[PDB]
A paper describes a structure:
The enzyme phospho­triesterase (PTE) is capable of hydrolyzing such OP compounds. Accordingly, it has been characterized from a number of bacterial sources, including Brevundimonas diminuta (Bd; formerly Pseudomonas diminuta), Flavobacterium spp. and Agrobacterium radiobacter. The present study focuses on Bd_PTE, a dimeric metallohydrolase that has a (β/α)8 TIM-barrel fold with two Zn2+ ions embedded in the active site. Carbon dioxide reacts with the side chain of Lys169 to form a carbamate functional group within the active site, which serves as a bridging ligand to the α-Zn2+ and β-Zn2+ ions, both of which are required for full catalytic activity. The buried α-Zn2+ ion is ligated to the protein via direct interactions with His55, His57 and Asp301, and the exposed β-Zn2+ ion interacts with His201 and His230.
The addition of ZnCl2 during expression, purification and crystallization resulted in the presence of two Zn2+ ions in the active sites of A53_2, A53_3 and A53_4, all three of which crystallized under different crystallization conditions. Apo structures of the octapeptide-tagged A53 variant were obtained using three different crystallization precipitants: AS with glycerol, PEG 6000 with MPD, and PAA, which resulted in crystal structures A53_2, A53_3 and A53_4, respectively. Interestingly, the crystal structure of A53_2 has a monomer in the asymmetric unit and the dimer is formed through a crystallographic twofold axis in space group P43212, as observed in the structures of several other PTEs: A53_5, C23_2, C23_3, C23_4, C23_5, C23M_1 and C23M_2. Notably, when AS and glycerol are used as precipitants, the binding of OP ligands displaces the cyclic compounds X3B or X3T initially observed in the apo structures. Indeed, in the PTE variants studied, OP hydrolysis products could only be observed in the active site when co-crystallization was the method adopted, and only in crystals obtained from AS and glycerol in space group P43212. The electron density in the active sites of the A53_5, C23_3 and C23M_2 structures co-crystallized with methylphosphonic acid clearly indicated that the ligand replaced the six-membered ring present in the apo structures (X3B in A53_2 and X3T in C23M_1), and two of the three O atoms of the OPs are in close contact with the two Zn2+ ions at similar interatomic distances of 1.9–2.0 Å.
Numbering used by the authors:
A (entry chain A), B (entry chain A): 34 to 262, 264 to 362
The structure:
């Protein structure tokens, strides 16, 4: 209620501080880091890289990240706890399902999925006792039949616990509209939902249609850009819009009166096995600041564009605390 | 060379004894049993069910099973070792990839996949030190581009180590023909390959085309039948051919001179989360003998049809030892 669950236990709302609401320690697949740690060099190399990156983010002002890696994105909460302790940065873990559920998940009913999400929120993840503080869901265009069940189960789990829901979208296909429709059919308040990857589109009619009915808007991939990259795989993933173009959507929604509904993040990672080999090297070339990109480069950019510091503090501190605090 | 790796260490060829070459302790997905053990009631309930089933198979004469669950079928070698110790039945574990690889596998090259398979054969699975004694691969119709890489990587891993390859097929689509073509393009001897689920078809021209060029023929789902089952999901999985019809394919290949190339098994499981809920209950209703079905019902059936006991001993003891013994 007045506590947010992290990988090291409950924290008070004021302890969260400056919070990045959509990040990843390691974007992988279930069991993959355990079965093939050499893919990342070594598990120890991955830990060290993440600790260094989180320590640099902390020096830039970050106090909490929300790791929105699910079961099928290879979430390893023991890894998150280790890196969180070493870097002195709170990490909120996720339940839910992302874009790669295995058969043992894809065959389940809405009731079964709700049981699984509630397990990870209310009891713990695996045998770790670590509880999720957010529910992550995904569509990539029109929802599959199974994805409709996932979104409904996420709504039921959030209605039982007060934990918020955050989504992956194909933003240029306006996925958030169908996601909202399904969420609302289950009775979920839009104030409990962040429609993510919304900085992937420039369509203000789509974005304000979501914000007008009360959704939080996840402008969460600000440094994702392949401008300057011959590299087909990187351009497909990162897009050809500049980080400045994405960042100006923050100002656009402020100027329309939605400052309390904006969540900002990097959607960064320290390991990334669910895409092409060496993508992490390419991404780190594009954005050497990693997760510190938001405070080091986006915040000063918005200040120079005239956004008051108080407004940016509200977006990076107040909005995440309101979102993450469990409530109906 | 003269040792077969099991989940409890190396065993001599003569220790293997009566061997079921295609079985599963638990057909699941990577990480699923760890994240949601209540799906199986409890992990302890699954262990007890498997120990009881393996003890009954041992009483019927079974000494070894080959668990052909891969990474993506949720293979948990620690579970296999626990059940193997409690039941006093050797268990050979598998590497490879089955029909549900996650993104972190599906994006890999043939070289990367070969590294992963060799890791599990030569070094160990996860951090357990348990080494795989077989490589499992799968197609379901025409091979996907990725499945072609998997079959090539399996061939390269087998060529480096002498460990055999065993396959999942859509037998009525004659998948074994393309699998053989890819294997042979990499230089793999057919004597190192079992084309599995071959009892799913009655096409003798397909089966003898594989056997004539030297492949082992996996007649591995003998008790799979939905005769007597209204139940659409079970009929889709188990088929409408009787176990006697499947078993008579053993006699057919003996009568054509291929007795040394036949491998027989149940393709049974004690847990099964990668299909519809409660499928395990339906399967256990169909075949209460479980993994003991081959010795308790198929062997006497073939004897009554005139197959000499020496021939059946060759199929159930000699052929698996020759297949599993590492060699080029
Ligand atoms: C940049 C990434 O990595 C995986 C998670 C994602 O969907 O947010 O996309
Ligand atoms: C009966 C089953 O379970 C999963 C493995 C399979 O492909 O052999 O099919
Ligand atoms: Zn995403
Ligand atoms: Zn993400
Ligand atoms: Zn199979
Ligand atoms: Zn099988």
């Amino acid at each position: 209620g007045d506590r947010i669950n992290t990988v090291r236990g409950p924290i008070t709302i004021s302890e969260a501080g400056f919070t990045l609401t959509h990040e990843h320690i390691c974007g992988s697949s279930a069991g993959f880091l355990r079965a093939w740690p050499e893919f990342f060099g070594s598990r120890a190399a991955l830990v060290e890289k993440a600790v260094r990156g989180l320590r640099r983010a902390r020096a830039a002002g970050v106090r909490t990240i929300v790791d929105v890696s699910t079961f099928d994105a290879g979430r390893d909460v023991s890894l998150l706890a280790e890196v969180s302790r070493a870097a002195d940065v709170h990490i909120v873990a996720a339940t839910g399902l992302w874009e790669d559920p295995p058969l043992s998940m894809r065959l389940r009913s809405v009731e079964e999925l709700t049981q699984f999400f509630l397990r990870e929120i209310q009891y713990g993840i695996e045998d770790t006792g670590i509880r999720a503080g957010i529910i992550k869901v995904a569509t990539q265009g029109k929802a599959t039949p199974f994805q409709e069940l996932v979104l409904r189960a996420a709504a039921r789990a959030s209605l039982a616990t007060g934990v918020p829901v955050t989504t992956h979208t194909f933003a240029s296909q306006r996925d958030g509209e169908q996601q909202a429709a399904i969420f609302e059919s289950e009775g979920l308040s839009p104030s409990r939902v962040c429609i993510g990857h919304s900085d992937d589109t420039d369509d203000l009619s789509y974005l304000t249609a979501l914000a007008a009915r009360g959704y939080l808007i996840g402008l969460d991939g600000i440094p994702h850009s392949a401008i300057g990259l011959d590299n087909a795989s990187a351009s497909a993933l990162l897009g050809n819009r500049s980080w400045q173009t994405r960042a100006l959507l923050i100002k656009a929604l402020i100027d329309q009166g939605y400052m309390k509904q904006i969540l900002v993040s990097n959607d960064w990672l320290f390991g990334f096995s669910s895409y092409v080999t060496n993508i992490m090297d390419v991404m780190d070339s594009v954005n050497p600041d990693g997760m510190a990109f938001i405070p080091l480069r986006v915040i000063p950019f918005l200040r120079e564009k005239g956004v008051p510091q108080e407004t940016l503090a509200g977006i990076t501190v107040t909005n995440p605390a309101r979102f993450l605090s469990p409530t109906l």
